[PDB]
Design a protein around this ligand. Structure first.
Ligand SMILES: [Cl-]
Ligand SMILES: [Fe+3]
Ligand SMILES: [Fe+3]
Ligand SMILES: [Fe+3]
Ligand SMILES: [Fe+3]
Ligand SMILES: [Fe+3]
Ligand SMILES: [Fe+3]
Ligand SMILES: [Fe+3]
Ligand SMILES: [Mg+2]
Ligand SMILES: [Mg+2]
Ligand SMILES: [Mg+2]
Ligand SMILES: [Mg+2]
Ligand SMILES: [Mg+2]
Ligand SMILES: [Mg+2]
Ligand SMILES: [Mg+2]
Ligand SMILES: [Mg+2]
Lengths: 172, 172, 172, 172, 172, 172
């Protein structure tokens, strides 16, 4: 047992490892999206920049969990980061819709982790999740919803004009 | 066929996808290493910082390859990123030795890429590898070799004093 | 034989003169395109600026080749610069498509030049072409391909709105 | 007919196209001269710089005429730019004498254009020529005459010392 | 075998040692030239400064190769630096002509080294030579040729006036 | 006989040429030492910097002697510069010990030079040696002796920790 460890259930430790993996997977999905928009036959540079930004943000989310794991005296165990579920993300709209689905899946995982921390009476872990993760997720989900809505109302994905103008005026 | 594609062999395109995966793997190994040194029972903060910087550098190496693949009209295909070979890296000296081994393995892959690019008469790809990768690897390998040497000469890994003092005076 | 000449094959010398002529031709093509967009019945001021900038760049590419010819002791022989293929470049999309074609034609010449320099074991010439020309072409080809893609997806050339909006938000 | 066209005679339009061609030819002559002085066996760097500057100015002279042609609603038609009359310009003095002859030829064409514009009662064209071109030519011709005189009085082109010192003290 | 060494042929190692020696010899030749022009009976202070500058530059060229040798895990082995072939360099012109011959001999050595690196499939070493040495040599050879030409056209070495004025206006 | 030559004995002129050679040899020994410490299997970056600085200082010592030889109307005669006695300098302590031996050998030569200058009643040469050389040698010898002492007292060369810590705290 680590000399620092106090009130840290083994189930919470294991669950924090799994959340690290999910954050690293989200980072990889956004990286994939980014370079899809960088293709010569897609060529939406601000979609590309948006998703790259989100990729680097997810890596930071993973690093903060790795730091937490050590702070609490848990031990990090890593698994493979699986490839994202698509290679070609089809359109600006479809990518935003898949990102929305991703952020809601990551939110679900974090809500399950909070419920576990609550059952194990771990208020430090509860506060960590609330402070650094839950409102970050709500804001992300709201932002992505707003983007999806505007893309649909403008005529995407059938209007390539709509995606071009969105790239310029929202993501630019 | 991409409208930009010119003098870009399918075999070179596949090889660049393999190298992307390898750079992402290297990023992941260094990330693992970094947080091993952040453990309370290891506690070498500048080893941790050093390897986190290397992890962010490798992600940049991968991103630049993704950018190249698109510039030449190839198509990115991402794969699962393998977990690192170790969970516990044993000591500062052992980590630096495994990092040296990793960087030589990445260099060998790049040298094989370059041989392929030469066989396919792709001078743009040869210059890209040379300019951005090969000297970066040579400098990394020399630096890691210097660190291993210092750590051995100081008495690591037996001497925990050695690793402490190297963390402060070389890495900090 | 010039006092400075060393390892510079006569075939290389002639090839450099051919490449000088092609770069001056490319400069003239872009000049032509630029002032087409300046017509009152076309009136896309940022397309005009974009192509004028490209014209001046190609002049610089020509001058650098003339400097190289003298550096290596070869002798410059200029020829008539042929007029561009078109007087009227039809639309912003069609001009971009023709520019893409021209930049791939220029690249193919450069790659043939590099092949010749490789066969003649002229690594200074190889490095010159790699350093100053090949990535410049790859970047120009990628940029033009992105521009074509955007104009197509926006609905050009039929939509004069697409070209107006692209002129403002991409080129301006 | 262009919507902007007013008091602009088809004979003036054609004369403007011929003048564009002549300004581009002059640009090419001076480019040739410049890189002759860059040869290792000539090696007068300030003669080389002087003539490159002049080459770039002539391109600007062409560009301003192209802008004029579109301002008036004429249509630019470009032609082949013929190679200069010499490959080797013999000496600094002989290059300056040829440049003097070129600038008089250019002036004679501009004077013929002015006479046509006068005959066709085109005061805007008359003023454009007078404002932008006629005094620029008078100044160029006077400078070149001054330079030829100096070189002759210093003892060129037999005195390689003459041309060296002129390169330093007048063109430097 | 050094722990850093990878893809570095023993013949390339030995050849890099020999190039270190040639760079140090070039440094010594320029040092000799410099202080010849410092003599009271020669007294061309800017020739003296020019060659001293070139001497210190050659030492830097040697140091960069010694660093390369270590980077690649080769071992430096030094031999005597032979005295330059003259004690009295006769004139400004004759010294520039001998410097031209020296730089072409150093260029030949570097081209032979590149051909060896190519045969041994060592693209890192090829890139090192191209990036740091080959264009440096071309520029040096061109500069020296230009100096020789001007000195000859001005009347050197029989005109001491010519050498004095060159000292002042070119090398000053 | 030089027009500047006054009270300058042929024997003093020859002795100054011998001292030039010796200073150039000292520069070369320190250059060797510097890059021994840059090896991956030695890896003491501040020993390397220290000895490279000393090498550049010795070249300055040689240049100043060359300047003196010309000031007094003597004639410089350069000789082959002998390779250093060792290729592998063994350890930081052993290098500093050999550097101490080298500086005492240079000092002995300067003391012999001064004795000669005194015998020939050359007070200008005596003052030159005193002002520029003798105290420089005394300070070098004392510094090297201090370094050797520290390294021995710390436990070098057995203790690789000692040389590491001296590199950081004294030399860095
Ligand atoms: Cl300490
Ligand atoms: Fe996240
Ligand atoms: Fe990498
Ligand atoms: Fe070009
Ligand atoms: Fe003009
Ligand atoms: Fe050199
Ligand atoms: Fe000394
Ligand atoms: Fe300390
Ligand atoms: Mg709270
Ligand atoms: Mg790195
Ligand atoms: Mg361009
Ligand atoms: Mg190559
Ligand atoms: Mg002019
Ligand atoms: Mg290169
Ligand atoms: Mg010293
Ligand atoms: Mg005294």
């Amino acid at each position: 047992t680590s000399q620092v460890r106090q009130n840290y259930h083994q189930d919470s430790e294991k669950a924090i490892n799994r959340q690290i993996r999910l954050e690293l997977y989200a980072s990889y999905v956004y990286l994939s999206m980014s370079y899809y928009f960088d293709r010569d036959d897609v060529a939406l540079k601000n979609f590309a920049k948006y998703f790259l930004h989100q990729s680097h943000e997810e890596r930071e989310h993973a690093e903060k969990l790795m730091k937490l794991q050590n702070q609490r005296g848990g031990r990090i165990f890593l698994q493979d980061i699986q490839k994202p579920d698509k290679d070609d993300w089809e359109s600006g709209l479809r990518a935003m819709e898949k990102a929305l689905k991703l952020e809601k899946k990551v939110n679900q995982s974090l809500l399950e982790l909070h419920k576990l921390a609550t059952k194990k009476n771990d208020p430090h872990l509860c506060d960590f999740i609330e402070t650094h993760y839950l409102n970050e997720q709500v804001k992300a989900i709201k932002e992505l919803g707003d983007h999806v809505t505007n893309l649909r109302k403008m005529g995407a994905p059938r209007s390539g004009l709509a995606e071009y103008l969105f790239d310029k005026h929202t993501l630019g």
